[PDB]
RNA sequence: UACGAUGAAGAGUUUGAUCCUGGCUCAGGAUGAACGCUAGCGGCAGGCUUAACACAUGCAAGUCGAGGGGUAGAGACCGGCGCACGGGUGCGUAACGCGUAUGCAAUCUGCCUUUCACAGAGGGAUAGCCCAGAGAAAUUUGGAUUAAUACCUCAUAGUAUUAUAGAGCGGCAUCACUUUAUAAUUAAAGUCACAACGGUGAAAGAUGAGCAUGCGUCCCAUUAGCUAGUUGGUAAGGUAACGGCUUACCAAGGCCACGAUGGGUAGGGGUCCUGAGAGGGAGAUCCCCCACACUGGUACUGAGACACGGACCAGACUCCUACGGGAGGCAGCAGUGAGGAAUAUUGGUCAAUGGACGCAAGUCUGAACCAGCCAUGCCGCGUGCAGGAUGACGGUCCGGAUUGUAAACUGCUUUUGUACGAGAAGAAACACUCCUAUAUAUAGGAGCUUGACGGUAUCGUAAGAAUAAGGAUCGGCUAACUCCGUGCCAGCAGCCGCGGUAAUACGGAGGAUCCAAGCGUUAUCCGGAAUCACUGGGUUUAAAGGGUCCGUAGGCGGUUUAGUAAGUCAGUGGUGAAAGCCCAUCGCUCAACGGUGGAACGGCCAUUGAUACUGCUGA
């Protein structure tokens, strides 16, 4: 399933615009609710800190707790940095790459364009948002819905995107020092090892 | 009579057979003697992985192939090689 | 202690006696009630808790506690015991599922509807 | 019962009468024989041929017979 | 400043307050799960854990006319093969039953493969049919009788068997393999002609089936003696085969504290869950071994059974009866009654694979492949995406804040749902007519060929955000707070514990948190529990030194030196099935799933080395 709800609320309950720094991030930036607008609780537990740091990443991309735990224990099979490979495989998702390529300016629109047979991956059309893009994939756009109204309206360090043929040539898997995200993976690892 | 037959081991809808020599009094996909080859009729060429080093050995020891077994061992060899005395 | 003593007689592992024993290790058990009455807690609580003497299908006489408010529970009714003791009534070590075969649910309940067997309004 | 089931109870009787005949005919001889020794060996070998007496056991009997007649 | 190892969290609660020991509970994972609330699909997997309780009805093992007489117009019978496979259950069994490693010089082996020697003459019967019956039926009794690849005589045949007599080789004791004479004894089958299929004997191989052995095989010592064919031997009967397996005789032996015997429970393993690991808990589904077929016993046929859908006898149930007598066994598939908290269609097809029969065509196959039901579990998707003001309405404060870009409204997409049009793979073959070579063995190519699923998967076309979100929690543990009503009442509760009239703990409303087609409770397990501690605890005062010595079995061993190499270490060969977990890589649009490879299987047997440490022998 998906969230399918207010995104400004999710941005306010975390204090960080993860769906685009735009309207409503200011103008009562404090968390929502009749008791969040007032002086919140001062003492915040480390469990609350770790849980919210996990939920920030779980909400930014649109992953459920089940799939997030599956991906975490999948990435934990790598002998390297567990949080690093976790974030790498979370960024390697198809909808995330489509969102980073400029199309679908939000991930909520990425996981509505990728789930409509509007985008192709290495030839055959792949309409699975959770598709794991391995380094060295070729993402194109279906010629039927190539000249749409929203695609051209909406149109990184590792994505080589070409606007003439809707290219993007996903290669050179990025690292934590390159992926811009305000999340701490060590806290997520400690929470899942709790 | 030890026979050379096929064991189904694929998934529902897409079969995948093991060409294996086994006794006739055993279940289809259960006990066997020695795996010989492999048959995949999921592509147009109908891929096979026959082992002519043991196929002719079992045929000399007294194996008895079935219709599909002797049709797979036909266009992969070891039959025109088992005939040569 | 000594390795020779351990080789002779090793460490004795206990069996970890269970909690709910008179239900034959089943999640729920059907039963028929014989006496529905009210009892008092120990201390310092003060109430009138509703309990029923239930005879399970395996020939076991237990005391079950009726949760919530509103029920029929006549002198003979088919109930479904599930388990879970209470720290107020000495002897009552089981609970009755609300919403079972013959027992009633609850009316006017809107918060905890999965429990107490209440339909969605 | 089956059609094949109501054929073995009928054929095995015709087999068993002959088997019992040929078995007792030589059992009485090997009993009241303990020289006409070269007359029960033929019957023992015929039983072994008919698979009644298991040529292994038949040879056991043949060896045990001509060992005390000496 | 390298190597490998990707791995280890706590909290509440005894007291006015502190520390320590110590018990209880919670935070996590999992399931043949059940119950309550809720509910849109697809792929795959699973589905009587209880009464091995009783079964109505349908199907589940038949085939060969190229063995025979061949009848009506096929059926039935003799004969060959199969029915000992496949399928189901876990009653019983504490044991060579099972796992593991070997041995058989104490073994057998239909069908299958490869060689050698042959398939010569004869005869009497009897099925089926005919003539009469005795019986309600089941079923059965007389007469004469025609065939066989049915049966039975003689001759023939050995690297066949037995006995006597010579030998060689070779041991691991009993003795083993081969060869030579002599004597005795044991076979056949033909389908009118060809093709094609057959038959007998001997040897070898493969496969299958047995016996024995070393090791590991639950609890109770509030079970200390057990065994009388029992222990060993001498001769017979035997079984495929050694053997007290059985009998006759002689002796009194054999097991037992390193647990006999007795009682309770239980099919065993590969494996599944959990755990950092060592360990702990179970033995569904997949595979291997064992036991059973209403409860018990016995034997025949057969290579193979003491036989699920074969026979006989006895017992308890159900049915028929003319009262004399008879027929039965869903622990096979689908189903019924009962029991239970709880587990499904009286479905389709042999189209693929396997099995039986047949030269083949072909027949049967509730094995098997599909389909229906159950959110039971795993995986994936959706219930829209962008812009848009602080709008009504609610809860709250004394006009403000809250739900809130949330809404109304403005543009876009149909994944999914409906309608229409196209549309698969799973199918490789078998059998018959054509030329080639060699030899009756193999090989190529041709088309009318061969789909239950199924017009199923999949693709395209046209309206339309339309066809789709709920459950738990909010005092601490633990993520989330305000008001109204009740006033120790109603009630809540995993622990501390809350409610006696200003309840963040009860019921309702608003808001908030988590999960999500699922959410909670219960029941059974592992972790936390270092809370049975080898890893990894203690005994002055928290539970814990025997009242004290002697001493049996047992446990431990001062220094040096010589020998062996039992423990220990290293190498090699065999094995440690497949499946399953992990790693890597490919195909289902990803995943689940499937294919391939490696690692692992910590173990065991044989052999070759090292001798530092332990054991043995000597000084």
DSSP conformation letters of A25-68: SSSS-SPSSTTTSS---S---HHHHHHHHHHHHHHHHT--HHHH
Cβ neighbours for D21, distance < 8 A, ≥ 6 positions apart: none
* Separation between Cα atoms, residue A81 and residue A88, nearest integer Å: 10
Q: Is B68 exposed, middle or buried (0-12, 13-18, 19+ CB in 10 A)?
A: middle
Q: Is C42 left (phi over 0), alpha (psi -120 to 50) or beta?
A: alpha
Residue the block writes with tokens 């409509």: A116
Q: What is the DSSP letter of D51?
A: T
Query: Residue B3: which nucleotide is closest by CA–C1'?
Result: E112
Neighbours of chain C (3+ CB pairs under 8 A): none
**Contact criterion met (CB below 8 Å) for A104 and A154:** yes
Nearest to C78, CA basis, from C58, C60, C59, C104: C104
| Angle (nearest 5°) at CA C78 between C76 and C84 | 110
Chain E: nucleotides under 7 Å from a protein CB? 6-9, 25, 27, 33-40, 43-45, 61-63, 76-83, 85-87, 107-108, 110-114, 151-154, 161-163, 184-187, 201, 205-208, 237-241, 280-281, 286-289, 300-303, 307, 309-311, 328, 339-341, 352-356, 367-371, 379-390, 395-396, 401-406, 411-415, 425-430, 441-445, 460-461, 469-473, 477-482, 488-499, 507-517, 519-526, 532-534, 537-539, 554-555, 577, 582-584, 587, 589-590, 593-596
Length of chain A: 194
CA atoms within 13 A on the CB side of C44: 0
* Separation between Cα atoms, residue A104 and residue A150, nearest integer Å: 8
- Alpha helices for chain B (secondary structure H): 52-61, 67-72
Cβ neighbours for B70, distance < 8 A, ≥ 6 positions apart: B79
What six digits make up the tokens of A113? 């364009």
Contacts for D53-60: CB closer than 8 Å, 24+ residues apart: D53/D23
Q: Is A188 exposed, middle or buried (0-12, 13-18, 19+ CB in 10 A)?
A: buried
What six digits make up the tokens of D9? 């109870």
Peptide bond into C44 cis (omega under 30): yes
Closest alpha carbon to C1' of E386, residue? A109
In chain D the beta strands, taken as DSSP E runs, fall at: none
**Contact criterion met (CB below 8 Å) for A114 and A127:** yes
* Separation between Cα atoms, residue A109 and residue A188, nearest integer Å: 26
Residue C16 CA, nucleotide E271 C1', distance (Å): 27
> Measured on CA atoms in the order B28, B33, B37, B38, is the torsion positive or negative?
positive
Q: What is the DSSP letter of A194?
A: -
Query: Residue B38: which nucleotide is closest by CA–C1'?
Result: E595
**Contact criterion met (CB below 8 Å) for C103 and C82:** no
Beta bridge partners of B2: B23
Contacts for D63-69: CB closer than 8 Å, 24+ residues apart: D65/D30, D65/D33, D65/D37, D65/D40, D65/D41, D66/D37, D68/D34, D69/D35, D69/D37
CA atoms within 13 A on the CB side of D69: 12
Closest alpha carbon to C1' of E288, residue? B31
Residue A135 CA, nucleotide E132 C1', distance (Å): 99
Nearest to A116, CA basis, from A160, A88, A150, A92: A150
**Contact criterion met (CB below 8 Å) for C73 and C105:** no
Experimental method: cryo-EM
Q: Is A194 exposed, middle or buried (0-12, 13-18, 19+ CB in 10 A)?
A: exposed
Residue D47 CA, nucleotide E151 C1', distance (Å): 14
SS3 state at A94: helix
Residue A95 CA, nucleotide E592 C1', distance (Å): 21
* Separation between Cα atoms, residue A121 and residue A10, nearest integer Å: 31
* Separation between Cα atoms, residue A74 and residue A89, nearest integer Å: 9
Nominal resolution in Å?
Answer: 2.8
Instruction: Tabulate helix, strand, coil % of chain C (nearest 5).
Output: 5, 25, 70
Residue A130 CA, nucleotide E402 C1', distance (Å): 37
**Contact criterion met (CB below 8 Å) for A165 and A152:** no
């Amino acid at each position: 399933a998906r969230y399918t709800g207010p995104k400004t609320k999710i941005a306010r309950k975390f204090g960080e615009a993860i769906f685009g720094d735009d309207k409503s991030f200011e103008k009562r930036n404090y968390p929502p609710g009749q008791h969040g607008m007032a002086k919140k609780r001062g003492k915040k537990s480390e469990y609350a800190v770790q849980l919210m740091e996990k939920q920030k990443a779980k909400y930014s991309y649109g992953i459920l707790e089940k799939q997030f735990r599956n991906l975490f224990e999948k990435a934990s099979a790598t002998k390297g940095v567990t949080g690093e490979v976790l974030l790498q495989l979370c960024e390697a998702r198809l909808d995330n790459v489509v969102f980073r390529m400029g199309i679908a300016p939000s991930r909520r629109g990425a996981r509505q364009i990728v789930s409509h047979r509007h985008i192709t991956v290495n030839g055959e059309v792949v309409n699975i948002p959770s598709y794991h893009l391995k380094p060295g994939d070729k993402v194109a756009v279906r010629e039927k819905s190539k000249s749409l109204e929203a695609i051209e309206r909406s149109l990184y360090e590792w994505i080589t995107w070409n606007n003439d043929l809707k290219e993007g040539t996903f290669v050179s898997v990025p690292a934590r020092l390159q992926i811009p995200e305000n999340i701490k993976e060590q806290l997520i690892v400690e929470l899942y090892n709790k | 009579s030890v026979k050379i037959r096929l064991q189904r081991h694929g998934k529902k809808g897409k079969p995948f057979y093991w060409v294996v020599a086994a006794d006739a009094r055993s279940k289809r996909d259960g006990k066997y003697l020695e795996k010989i080859g492999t048959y995949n009729p999921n592509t147009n060429p109908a891929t096979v992985e026959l082992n002519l080093d043991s196929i002719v050995k079992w045929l000399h020891q007294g194996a008895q192939p079935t219709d599909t077994a002797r049709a797979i061992l036909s266009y992969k060899g070891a039959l025109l090689k088992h005939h040569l005395d | 202690p000594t390795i020779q003593q351990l080789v002779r007689t090793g460490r004795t592992q206990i069996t970890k006696k269970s909690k709910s024993v008179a239900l034959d290790s089943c999640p729920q058990r059907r039963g028929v009630c014989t006496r529905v009455y009210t009892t008092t807690p120990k201390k310092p609580n003060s109430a009138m808790r509703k309990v029923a003497r239930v005879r399970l299908t395996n020939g076991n006489e237990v005391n079950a506690y009726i949760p919530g408010e509103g029920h029929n529970l006549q002198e003979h009714s088919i109930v479904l015991v599930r388990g879970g003791r209470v720290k107020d009534l000495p002897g009552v070590r089981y609970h009755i599922v609300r919403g079972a075969l013959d027992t009633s649910g609850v009316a006017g309940r809107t918060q905890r509807r999965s429990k107490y067997g209440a339909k969605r309004p | 019962n089956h059609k094949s089931a109501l054929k073995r109870i009928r054929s095995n009787e015709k087999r068993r009468v002959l088997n019992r005949y040929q078995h007792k005919t030589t059992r009485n001889a090997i009993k009241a024989l303990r020289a006409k020794l070269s007359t029960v060996i033929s019957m023992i070998d015929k039983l072994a041929k008919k698979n009644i007496i298991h040529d292994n056991k038949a040879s056991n009997l043949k060896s045990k017979l001509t060992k005390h007649v000496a």
